[PDB]
Amino acid sequence: RLVKKVTSNLETELKFFKGRLVQELMQIVKNENGRIDHTSKNWQESASVLLNSQEKGAVSLAEVERAVSKMTQKLRDQKVSEEEVVNIESKLKFERASLEAKLFDDNEIKELINKRIKEDALRAIPFLGSDSESFMEKISPFVKLPDDSYSLLKANDKHHPFQNILYSNALKFFADSSDIGYLNDDSLKNLTPENLNAFEQAVAADIDKLMHHHH
């Protein structure tokens, strides 16, 4: 029962860390107007601090590892089966291997950044209901971003242009009125087969158009 909770905490610590990591990396790609270059001085410095900063209460994988060490110590203090505890230390080591690989591979970086471009766009839809995470899971399957979504990141732009495409279409199809600029739990009743396909069609088309104009 404890093992389950510690595993959740590890998963959670890593989802937060992974997120902030990708966010930073995107300021580098953005500042380079959408060119991926994992060999630059700035990338290597940024990657190193995000993976290995020792500084207390900083956002680093190193900092996650210390947290998890305390937890595996507490598990040992309370006599939890040693197999369960090593298993956890392994997951952590595997996650560090994955990231060390991904961070220096231009295709892996593209995957991470296009996933965050989509997470950002869904978070841009102003949902004031109970559970925004659930809302976005309902929408996510109707949105598939091109492989080259990252190349539209520009230094000058505060936001990826996909934000405005998901913002507009979500309200066009799911808000009770045009005047309102927010969804809430009442909006869920507008997630009909017809509106979900039309949203899917619309977002796909606006994205195709922007991609074509760019290339």
Q: Coil, strand, or helix at residue 183? A: strand
Query: Closest Cα partner for 10 from 72, 54, 59, 58?
Result: 72
Contact between 152 and 113 under an 8 Å Cβ cutoff? The reply is: no
Q: How was this structure obtained?
A: X-ray
Please report, as a single letter, which amino acid is at residue 186: D
Resolution of the experimental model, in Å, one decimal: 2.9
Q: Is 160 exposed, middle or buried (0-12, 13-18, 19+ CB in 10 A)?
A: buried
Residues facing residue 47 across a β-bridge? none
Measure Cα distances from 141 to 118, 121, 128, 136, 201 in Å: 11, 13, 21, 9, 12
206: number of Cβ within 10 Å: 17
The label of the residue with tokens 């997120």 reads 19
Contact between 151 and 107 under an 8 Å Cβ cutoff? The reply is: no
Taking the C-alpha atoms of residue 144 and residue 161, their distance in angstroms, rounded to an integer, is: 15
Taking the C-alpha atoms of residue 49 and residue 180, their distance in angstroms, rounded to an integer, is: 43
Taking the C-alpha atoms of residue 91 and residue 72, their distance in angstroms, rounded to an integer, is: 12
